[model samples]
Target: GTGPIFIKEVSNADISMGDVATLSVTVIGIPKPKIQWFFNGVLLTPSADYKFVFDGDDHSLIILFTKLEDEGEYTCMASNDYGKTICSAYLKINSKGEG
Candidate 1:
């Protein structure tokens, strides 16, 4: 209830490993809805490979390592116990080298 609300959308699924890639999960609700992020359909916890950060009124899922295992479906479950919604994106991981 203290921030702007808009259509919940996320972009920037295309990123290179070991780089700071940020995605936005637009939330449309009142009471400054809370955001919960997940990876591989599992609730994300305090770990070494991944972390969560909040930017002003926006929430972000930050990958510290950006490993191949990180490549998958990343989802966002935003709610405030009053309402719930889910949004997700796929992170495709790849590498380049000479065989």
Candidate 2:
């Protein structure tokens, strides 16, 4: 397939419960792969809490003011005319720290 979906690093997010979380995956391919995000094996739908951003060859998933329910495994799937591939990472939402 288009040079095998090469991921430099899978996004592992560790953020405060009430803070914003940004997870990203970097990839490059000949046909320019398309990105789809999943949470806990379920496909992600874009909304206020979940935002998908595509910047050139980089793809990102932004979570606004994370919550306990938001903690799960995130998968980044890349696809092209040649084939498809995926990578995953876990998201840890820690409670807000005391001052």
Candidate 3:
């Protein structure tokens, strides 16, 4: 009936390096919105280390065994017939020398 509205927002993260970080958001659309993940304005695709999980209206983007380069803004976008909505998350990977 309407575009995907995000009822839940993905929280920020501050995980250590070589850890797993999951960015999640919840949005629902009349026609079941299409969800996409992005990293610092770069689109993400499913792969060995990158994964997507959908549990009800909640959706997740998983980054397994993260590295220093994984530290950045992760975004979740839901698209539908009408329009779209977005959520952004902060990922700060701790370094050995810094932390």
Candidate 4:
């Protein structure tokens, strides 16, 4: 907490293969934090498989298409000129079929 700080958190995200699942985030001890998103620890670039939208006004990440592969550890890296922090959460994708 001494240097630049980046904190990341997620809420109960619900999504389906064709459905849109928006991930929520929050920041503390810092303002206007730069948010970097990743899925399974891999940086996500502009792609058709997935979409990453950062709402600077609302501080949220909108991820569309909830695929099974998307069900993994999602990380949020928020940073500033001072330092950076990371927070991670698991995305659970349930089968549409009967369990």
Candidate 5:
């Protein structure tokens, strides 16, 4: 079975409304691992509001113009021939102008 080692895990992201928020993780494994993104316990899709970015070992999701509806738990799942693992972080969105 391929063993996957996660070099980095997603961390909580705090951003204000109308700003961009990024969530990322790094993984290395045999058989080439795949990454999936989930928000508030639901699968996410690449859209104008949600964008996916990956740079080799690092994978990330970018939230465009964060909104109140975007504040929730985000999960990153990594899977390979061996098995699967997941990491999660909460996104906190501050109202526009709130300190």
Candidate 6:
């Protein structure tokens, strides 16, 4: 729109414990873009617990073994030389035999 970095869409997930959760969003930016992720206001990186995927215009985060600890807000930051933009999603988890 004005400068750079536009968030087109964001996706949130709700899953049960021991299940997998995925968060995705569509982003656009000039000079391409660099992306980072945060969970519950804490920065997270690609590790055994999480996976980061950049599929063309779609950026996604995969949470493995989602437990109660995984239930919280997940934020994605996309930035470029011109400016920055962010989008967030919330993940809700249920224990076994629960909805």
List per-prediction Cα lDDT, in the order shown.
Answer: 0.69, 0.83, 0.91, 0.65, 0.89, 0.80
Q: What is the lDDT, from 0 to 100, of the residue 94 in candidate 3?
A: 94
Candidate 2 lands at a TM-score of 0.86
lDDT (10s digit) by residue, model 5, range 22-74: 99899998878988899888999899888888999999999988888788999
Q: What's the TM-score of every candidate structure? A: 0.75, 0.86, 0.94, 0.69, 0.91, 0.85
Across 71-96, the per-residue lDDT of candidate 2 in tens digits comes to 88998888888888899999999875
lDDT of 3 by residue, 4-61 (tens): 8999988998999998998888888898999999899999999999999998898999
Off-target runs (Cα >4 Å) in candidate 6 are 1-7, 97-99
| Residue 22 local lDDT, model 4 | 65
Q: Give the number of the best model, judged by TM-score.
A: 3
What C-alpha lDDT, on a 0 to 100 scale, does residue 52 get in candidate 1? 74
Best by lDDT: 3
Residue 71 error, candidate 3, Å: 0.2
Weakest ten-residue segment in model 4 by summed lDDT: 1-10
Query: Which portions of model 2 miss their true places by more than 4 Å?
Result: 1-4, 96-99
lDDT of 6 by residue, 3-94 (tens): 34546656677798889898887777667787888988789978988999988878888888887878898988888888877888888898
lDDT of 5 at 63: 91
| Residue 40 lDDT, candidate 2, scale 0-100 | 86
Question: lDDT ranking from best to worst?
Answer: 3, 5, 2, 6, 1, 4
